[PDB]
Amino acid sequence: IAGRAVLIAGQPGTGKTAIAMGMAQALGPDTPFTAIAGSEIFSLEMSKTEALTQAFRRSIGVRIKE
């Protein structure tokens, strides 16, 4: 399934980022895990939509064996 979105919501200091880091650790290095903050998409080099497009495409990998 593609494009599924999940929100972790809760009070400050309730393990939200801890849950995200544990999810990242349970996945191996094989699966991409792009972690950015909301402020990082505001850039002078590109638009916000371009920054989010680059964030999305950084999360999909192409495994090629040769």
Binding site: S43, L44, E45, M46, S47, K48, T49, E50
Partner: peptide, 9 residues
């Protein structure tokens, strides 16, 4: 296209 894609830099 999305309406917010016109805000290019």
């Amino acid at each position: 296209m999305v309406g917010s894609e016109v805000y290019s830099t």
